[PDB]
Amino acid sequence: EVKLILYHWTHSFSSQKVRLVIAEKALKCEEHDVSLPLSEHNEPWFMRLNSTGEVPVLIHGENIICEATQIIDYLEQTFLDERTPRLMPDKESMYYPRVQHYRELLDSLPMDAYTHGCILHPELTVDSMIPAYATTRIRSQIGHDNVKYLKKILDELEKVLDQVETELQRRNEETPEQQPWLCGESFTLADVSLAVTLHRLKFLGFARRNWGNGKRPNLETYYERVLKRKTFNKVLGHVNNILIS
Amino acid sequence: EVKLILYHWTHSFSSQKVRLVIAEKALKCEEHDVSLPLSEHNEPWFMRLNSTGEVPVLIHGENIICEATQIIDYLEQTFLDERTPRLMPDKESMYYPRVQHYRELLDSLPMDAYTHGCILHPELTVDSMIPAYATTRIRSAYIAKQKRLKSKLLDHDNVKYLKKILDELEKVLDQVETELQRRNEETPEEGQQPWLCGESFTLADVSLAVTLHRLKFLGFARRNWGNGKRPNLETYYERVLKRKTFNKVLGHVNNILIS
Ligand SMILES: O=C(O)CCCCCCCCCCCCCCC(=O)O
């Protein structure tokens, strides 16, 4: 009788975290993807990745909530039925600080700057999933964006992923052969931030410099496991496929 | 073919500005009032004024826009058909500075704090349209001294705050009264009168009209106009009540008999 309504863009980074939370909490939601296959300039989704500074919006009865973080906090606070999974420990738990620390650390990453850098300076990527012609078109209609800045924030990204790799190492040492996620046994909001972040870095071609082939092996094992998680696959299994509008 | 969709609360101050803009631009819009006649605690709308910190949202094609100011800017920038009224002068107009100045001056008013203050400190109102029982519901030996004291201090601070912003509100309305005086002096007394900034109804008039109507609802009208005080403002308020768009959109929003 009281619908959950979400208006969103399928390929928006924000929308992906919201929809993965909806799936992990097993909620029924009427989801409206308002994006078009082709823009006014007949550009496809992969050339419009931060076209605007606009947010998804949730309508739930009387409540209208904008922005992924606020929507996700609303969802965690509202759906308290016993059979609805929680994605945060209680605020008085000693585990709350760890989950909130990693959620905030990952949500602070400038994903918009990585995407413009992938397109502007593809020489800094390996196996970018964005066609090369996107690069030559954005650089033409030009003729903040500097190589200096982008190399700086890619190194800052390395320091965040070092902290994550260390945390995942502590999980491995604690755990025999039911494997834990980033912060503990439960899949949490820090895991949706991490999983959706890694999948987008993969899309941008910033996966191989940060993990794989012996580098950050715990992170690589985490990424491979996330891809198989049924909720992640059901919600995000195609969001990296440029053949699908 | 491309619908305008608005989700909003009818009695929300923000929603009122957005819906008045939609009416003044003559746009077709699918409007969803998500407010309930009765809350879980069987309270009606006039006991839930700023219940939460939430905004209206406009969906238009691929665009999702939240908050009244951003929605209104989007509407002004997007609907450019020749027959669609403009509520802002062109950015190169000699009028643009004056409309933008009054729009931002009125949009800077802390309407939420006037609402909180009307309910918590009704002794500072005259002819509040909110029943007195809404006040008594919100207000509902050893360390009983401490909390008697702690509560007395926040009460002291909260009255001080409210008196401070009511004096700031007077200075805004003084500027508006002076502006409307210039309009009167410029215009022959017989015939059609301009609005706040000139002949056309603008975004500054939207902000002013909806602000005055809410001040009336809260009982902050009699200290600010009427009985010889700010007579240009009083004439403006009585005129905007008769404007067809304002009456069609907002004619009952102050009536607590209507759910
Ligand atoms: O003029 C009305 O009361 C609204 C009628 C609805 C149709 C739209 C007319 C737009 C009017 C633009 C500004 C004109 C000011 C009229 C002021 C007055 O006559 O008191």
Author numbering:
A (entry chain BBB): 23 to 165, 199 to 232, 235 to 302
B (entry chain AAA): 23 to 162, 184 to 302
List sentences quoted exactly from the publication behind this structure.
GDAP1, a 358-amino-acid mitochondrial outer membrane (MOM) protein regulating the mitochondrial network, is highly expressed in neurons and less in Schwann cells.
As no GST activity was detected for GDAP1, a metabolite library was screened for GDAP1 binding partners. Among ∼300 compounds in a metabolite library, HA showed an effect on GDAP1 stability, increasing its Tm by ∼3 °C. Due to its limited solubility, HA was titrated up to 250 μM, and a concentration-dependent Tm shift was observed. Interestingly, HA binds to GDAP1 in a pocket next to this cluster and forms a hydrogen bond with Arg282. HA binding increases GDAP1 stability by inducing a conformational change of the loop α6-α7, which is involved in the mutation cluster. The fatty acid-binding site observed in the GDAP1 crystal structure faces the membrane-binding surface in the context of the modeled full-length dimer, suggesting that the observed ligand could mimic the lipid membrane surface. GDAP1 could be a fatty acid transport protein due to its localization on MAM and MOM and its fatty acid binding shown here.
